[PDB]
Symmetry: C3
Subunit: 136 residues, 3 copies
């Protein structure tokens, strides 16, 4: 009757440094922490604003997915939090470079402020494969 | 070992204005995108403010639920995102016309802005039936 | 084939002041509503500000978890919604009084406004154990 729950941690994404995990896996469902454009090495936000931060946040998410045996095709839901709702056109273009098709469900909105003054934070839910459309 | 994962897509609700699906069904859990009060025919927000937008957003969610085999009773969690926290009474009154009992868990708060200048966005998680309640 | 959906209800946490349930359990997953620093017996926010409200909100979350046969170790994801981003450190130190290892995944950010003028709201997803690593 037990289920495995394991905390994902990879050095290719910025480390926790706090009472949170990069992501938690529990019977094929992966809850991924909100990712911002932090460089895993420098511990600082990359420079350049939303375009550069979005790219970095998505790479960070990709490395976490990888450590769980997944890729972007496994993501079923994201939340995209913005410092400015008007950055959507830019953000969408970058988002589509990682999420190429069969897009996750999504919620999206502008918040009042994000950690470290970032312009974007992306959280996600993913499911460990293998996956099928067939009702079997 | 395979789990069923399928996108839900109905013309009864608005087409995506960005790279997202209306909902994703995965092993009985349905993740529904944030819905706003956009008319499915025109692709524009309905006129009249928060009360009319909330209604349309819920109708849109309802059509997505239907296409996933589900109705409002299958919803287990929602997030209500408001342009103005003072609209809560108005929003709840409308919310209760759709969700009538065994209510979903819920988070609610005011955000800075929503897509298309909407006054409300509602996301949800539902579970595909059969479901039997204690 | 049929999954049971159970609404979690306990007088040890504040009763709902809107159309929502404290938490909903379905097939092992427990979706917990956003908790604020309200005292169950008065149904009013505690005094003292964010520090006091955060402790109360977590305490309310703990009672809801216990009512579902869980504790804080069962939590796999939280969202911390702040009225002020600068309250983060204060809230984080309190959060660590409850979560001690195998930490939940997390999102944190500042919103425009929370219900009843609250300085913090915390929602969560938890999974019914036993949960193991092996």
């Amino acid at each position: 009757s037990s289920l495995i729950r394991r905390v994902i941690s990879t050095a290719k994404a910025p480390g926790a440094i706090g009472p949170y995990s990069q992501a938690v896996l529990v019977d094929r469902t992966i809850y991924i922490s909100g990712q911002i454009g932090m460089d895993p090495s420098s511990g600082q936000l990359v420079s350049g604003g939303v375009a550069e931060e979005a790219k970095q946040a998505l790479k960070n998410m990709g490395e976490i997915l990888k450590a769980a045996g997944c890729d972007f095709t496994n993501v079923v839901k994201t939340t995209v939090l913005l410092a400015d709702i008007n950055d959507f056109n830019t953000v969408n273009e970058i988002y589509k470079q990682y999420f190429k098709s069969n897009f996750p469900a999504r919620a999206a909105y502008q918040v009042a402020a994000l950690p470290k003054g970032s312009r974007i934070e992306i959280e996600a839910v993913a499911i460990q494969g293998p996956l099928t459309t067939a009702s079997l």
